[PDB]
Amino acid sequence: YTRVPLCEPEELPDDIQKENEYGTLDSPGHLYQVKSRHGKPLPEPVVDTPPYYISLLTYLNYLILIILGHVHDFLGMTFQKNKHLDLLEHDGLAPWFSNFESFYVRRIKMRIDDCFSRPTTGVPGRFIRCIDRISHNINEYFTYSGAVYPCMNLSSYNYLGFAQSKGQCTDAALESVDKYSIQSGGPRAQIGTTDLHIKAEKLVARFIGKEDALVFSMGYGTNANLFNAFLDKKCLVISDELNHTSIRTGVRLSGAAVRTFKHGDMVGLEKLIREQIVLGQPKTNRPWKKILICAEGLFSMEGTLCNLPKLVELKKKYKCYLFIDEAHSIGAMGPTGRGVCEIFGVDPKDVDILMGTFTKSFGAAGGYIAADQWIIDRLRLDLTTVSYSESMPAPVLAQTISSLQTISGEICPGQGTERLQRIAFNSRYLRLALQRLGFIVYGVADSPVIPLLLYCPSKMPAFSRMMLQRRIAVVVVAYPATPLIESRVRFCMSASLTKEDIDYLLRHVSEVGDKLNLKSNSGKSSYDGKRQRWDIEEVIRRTPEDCKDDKYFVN
């Protein structure tokens, strides 16, 4: 009962499983094509705020929580010691971790831990199967029973719906298993490399638009073991404050000086560049050997794009270098799917190094780096992962190659464009409907991530638990991951969902939010400068036609 059960697969006809994994389009009117911005710069984004009493209530709640937590910790660890044997010295040995460094997890998150780490089963498609569990004590241990129920999926990184067990990719993977075994001999330098690795590398290099590319087995290791190859203690790195942990770990391992600039502030970046060029190295005022700029394509937390032409202008005029990450932008953004370069029309030669990850949009595991020729030839000899780690297995390579060929159009014609149109329409429709209902939604008009703000801490577990009873799966984030005031729920849209599912979700979310008083719109979301408190039927009837027009989005 305590251990997680192993679920026997169910027997169903092919059509039912296909419908469960991938939906079937009802009308050809649910598709949208994405245009390219030639010479229109990105306007400064606008954010909306709630009234003051929300902030005051949040601060009071946090103050009470902190006071009570500290009082309980002190009294419990002073008046008794038998229960707290994992936080005290025993036979002259220090404990594993410290009291003060794990206060939040032990005292705040533990009471709502049931909303995290939810076991599942089966393919994560349109409907995801979940194992039922019963909470005991206060989220201490769980008891499992042999019962599974389906739920709607809004919490998985599946943008183009490639997570399927029936299709060309699965057949390619099975054929690869038949030909190449799952064994990997060793590092790519010794025995690991084969012809399929070269095929994948050339195909990726042709798809992206650069000259050469390399493949890896893990996205984290692509960043964590890259910067030490060509950086040292006499170089400067300028990075946005909202960057992934892998980049920070790589820069820390490299040893270069780090300076950060505020998100979406180019003037501060220019001032910092000028000051760092003039001043030089600390304690010596010698010039820097080189300067590198790091940025991300699409930020998952807010769904906002980076300003690429301005960065290109600065890097050209001040003679700097550029590095761009496209983990959430490849295969899902642009007229064809090349990335932010197609969105902005910027030639890919300007960017020095490009990076990406197969898992978010292709249904595999890996990463890549794309650059010029001589850079790749030097980095191949200078890298550490190539000659010290394992190699990429064959089924993953087959899945990635099949997905890339399908999206490019070589095989299975008329599928990639249809998927891209589906995801664009779904994202736009959901964002517009949510803004018309009266909520607060962040991001650009066409972004697969839709963050909805839920300010008061006590309103997060209630929303998460109420949505589960209505068979909708959601993911919620909070402090310290997000700022103290702003707590949000993240929506991940797919190309497998259908307008009926969106309507069902909209009705249930609207009623739950009306119950929990989550509607706080100050009129800056509307393009006509007025408050929007509509009805659900009117939204469902009018939004699908009017969502294609671009005049209804502030940004």
Binding site: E19, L57, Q469, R471, Y504, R507, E511, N517
Partner: protein, 60 residues
């Protein structure tokens, strides 16, 4: 096109239709959700501290 998915009927929509207290329920929700109670355990006695209503009830 059929899928093995169960649809939960919505409250106030084919649940209470085919099948004074609303004000009390709304007041209770407003009192509970806007205060810090869910991340508390065993701290339901903190509501006793909110006896100020009784103190201000008496006038003159």
């Amino acid at each position: 096109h059929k899928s093995s998915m169960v649809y939960i009927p919505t409250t106030k929509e084919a649940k209470r239709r085919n099948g004074l207290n609303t004000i009390e329920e709304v007041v209770e929700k407003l009192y509970w959700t806007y205060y810090i109670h869910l991340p508390f355990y065993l701290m339901a006695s903190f509501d006793s501290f909110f006896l100020h209503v009784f103190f201000l009830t008496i006038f003159s």
